[PDB]
Amino acid sequence: DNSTYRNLQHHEYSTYTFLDLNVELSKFRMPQPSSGRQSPRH
């Protein structure tokens, strides 16, 4: 039970794994706060 390395899921990640996961997570997020302007240059 304490002899095998179980962190083997990471020998499959590709370049876009992190960003694809970020895309998948977008629906669970909450609305972002707004500073009232579109940009500090506005």
Partner 1 sequence: GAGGALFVHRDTPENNPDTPFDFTPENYKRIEAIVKNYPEGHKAAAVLPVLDLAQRQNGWLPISAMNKVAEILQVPPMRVYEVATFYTMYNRKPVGKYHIQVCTTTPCMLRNSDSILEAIQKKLGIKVGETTPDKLFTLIEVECLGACVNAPMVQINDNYYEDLTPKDIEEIIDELKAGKIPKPGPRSGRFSCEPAGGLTSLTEPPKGPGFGVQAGL
Partner 2 sequence: TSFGSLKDEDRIFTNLYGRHDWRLKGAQSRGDWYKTKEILLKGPDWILGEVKTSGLRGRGGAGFPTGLKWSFMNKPSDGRPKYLVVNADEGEPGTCKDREIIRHDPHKLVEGCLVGGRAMGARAAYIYIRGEFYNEASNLQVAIREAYEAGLIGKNACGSGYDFDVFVVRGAGAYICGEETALIESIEGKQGKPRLKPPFPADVGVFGCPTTVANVETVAVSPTICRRGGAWFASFGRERNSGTKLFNISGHVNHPCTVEEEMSVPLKELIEKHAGGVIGGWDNLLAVIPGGSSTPLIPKSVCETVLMDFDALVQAQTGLGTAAVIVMDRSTDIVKAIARLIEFYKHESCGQCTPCREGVDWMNKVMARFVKGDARPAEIDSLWEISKQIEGHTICALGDGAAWPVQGLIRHFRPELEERMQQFALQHQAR
Partner 3 sequence: WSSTADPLSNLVLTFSTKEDAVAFAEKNGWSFDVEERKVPKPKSKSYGANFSWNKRTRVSTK
Q: For binding to partner 1 (CB under 8 A), which residues are involved? A: 1-2, 5, 7, 10-11, 15-16, 19-20, 22-23, 26, 29, 32-40, 42
**Sign for the pseudo-dihedral over CA of 38, 39, 40, 41:** negative
Residue among 2, 30, 37, 38 that touches partner 3 (CB under 8 A) = 37
Q: How many CA atoms lie within 13 A of 32 on its CB side?
A: 5
In the complex, minimum distance from the CB of residue 34 to partner 3, in angstroms, rounded to a whole number:
9
- If one asks whether residue 29 binds partner 3 (CB under 8 A), the answer comes out as no
